[PDB]
């Protein structure tokens with residue numbers, strides 16, 4: 263029993279973290295085979311950040327301008343190129359600790375583990391969700407750029423996030439490993455803001471199923487609802503719409519607990535309309551939306 | 565900025581996890597140098613569990629009755645001994661991935677990372693605190709015994725917990741790496757229950773200081789309190805007493821934010837009386853007690869957002 267925000271074991275990713283230095287800037291890189299991946303903003307000075315022309319800044323750099331340190335060993339940079347907002351530094355040694363991996367782009371609502379790093383050294387691991395507004399509520403300080411997000415699908419690491427910046431509200435923005443930003447953000451010091459966020463409905467339902475599996479049932483009721491009436495309520499409370507795809511994905515949890523998805527939707531409707539009335543669910547006074555249906559099944563059954 | 569429940573990177577511990585089998589029972593073991601540590605209850609049947617005589621059960625076992633599997637490799641057991649509630653299996657290979665490590669016994673209120681494992685293979689990592697009633701609120705299923713708790717302040721792993729059992733209320737109990745249980749618990753299937761738990765006051769204060777460092781001051785007030793009046797009020801909400809040791813430990817956070825410890829105590833007294841009135845603190849609608857003063861300093865910026 264028990265239910266905790268759980269990250270994947272980070273060992274396979276720790277063996278890939280390196281320190282990348284360009285001029286006075288030091289940040290983190292991901293070393294896979296003979297390539298080190300890092301944010302392209304490593305080549306910028308503070309003044310360049312206002313309106314950088316990355317192609318022009320890069321042409322002025324030689325391979326020896328990039329210092330890559332893996333533990334206490336210097337790696338030799340033998341090539342460099344850009345792919346979208348990530349710099350790819352070709353090195354002379356393949357990482358002997360390279361795990362089986364893929365680069366995947368995740369959808370809003372999906373969760374992943376973040377390995378926070380400073381000077382190429384891992385400092386902590388925590389679980390995040392890609393918000394509907396394409397930000398992540400992480401915990402990052404100066405020097406954390408290049409820290410990565412991932413999931414592990416068996417023995418294969420799926421890298422899905424690389425950290426680039428913090429927005430004025432204290433939330434975080436980054437790219438996939440192909441350098442495409444999540445959300446309408448850019449790698450330049452211009453005015454940017456997180457858009458209004460919404461709650462991930464399918465994940466709140468998954469967490470209510472986790473609460474039932476763990477013995478917390480007070481919120482269950484005799485009522486059911488239709489998908490259309492439930493979505494009229496969800497919109498009023500700034501919850502994402504629930505689709506038939508979401509209902510299908512919750513199928514297994516519904517079968518195990520004997521609570522149909524629309525039966526759980528009626529409990530959620532009541533919680534949104536009346537609050538918790540001084541009670542908690544899995545030790546929380548708010549409805550948690552950062553556990554996917556898969557996360558619940560993986561932790562509660564495996 | 566941001567504030568999350570953050571665990572230590574688990575790689576140094578993943579390289580130590582093995583599977584231990586004795587008869588039909590399989591659980592996890594920790595392989596450090598040439599010794600595999602695991603719960604001694606691996607030698608019990610379900611019937612043995614009511615009143616096991618571990619010395620009598622162990623004397624009937626030979627080294628070859630213990631099967632230890634590290635990845636896809638079988639390790640050879642060449643010795644065995646019991647130390648309190650842990651079994652120590654001497655093996656013929658030293659773990660080449662053994663990190664720099666130590667065994668530390670922790671006090672209530674201290675936090676640590678748990679690497680949940682099943683069949684010697686890591687499943688997930690999360691942060692836990694040793695509750696005042698000597699239990700932990702973890703996430704463990706059948707097969708998780710032998711999973712360990714640790715901290716990694718620097719490059720040295722400090723192992724502080726080994727998982728043995730789940731109590732009737734769904735909370736968890738275990739030992740230090742010398743086999744001494746935390747709390748009054750025993751490794752037998754008798755009626756035992758967790759004592760009434762309380763909130764870890766020093767950690768809630770640490771977390772209020774984290775909220776101030778990150779730019780939030782809404783909960784502060786113009787008042788102060790004496791330590792004794794604070795404790796009289798706190799104990800009415802089932803909060804642990806705050807001692808002069810706790811006040812001293814909060815000194816650095818107090819100096820960084822400019823808020824005296826007893827002034828933060830007055831804010832906590834008011835939050836206990838009023839609740840949050842629809843507001844949140846670091847994204848929570850409840851007062852958080854599983855971040856120590858040391859955890860706050862590790863994670864937070866050294867510059868407060870004034």
Ligand SMILES: N#Cc1ccccc1CN1CCCN(C(=O)c2cncc(Cl)c2)CC1
Pocket residue numbers: 301303402403404405406407426427428448449450451452565
């Ligand atoms: N791309 C981009 C971008 C876009 C707008 C502005 C600034 C940047 C880059 N910028 C500069 C490098 C240093 N930096 C951190 O190291 C950092 C990371 N996360 C959290 C914190 Cl508090 C600090 C901030 C990010």
Ligand SMILES: N#Cc1ccccc1CN1CCCN(C(=O)c2cncc(Cl)c2)CC1
Pocket residue numbers: 263603605613704705706707708709728729730750751752753754
């Ligand atoms: N020591 C002790 C003790 C003392 C009282 C009763 C039972 C035990 C041992 N017992 C038997 C082995 C299997 N088991 C789990 O694998 C387990 C762990 N954590 C959580 C869950 Cl749900 C299950 C339960 C623990």
Ligand SMILES: [Cl-]
Pocket residue numbers: 669670671674
């Ligand atoms: Cl301690």
Ligand code: NA
Pocket residue numbers: 482483484485486524525526528529
């Ligand atoms: Na219902």
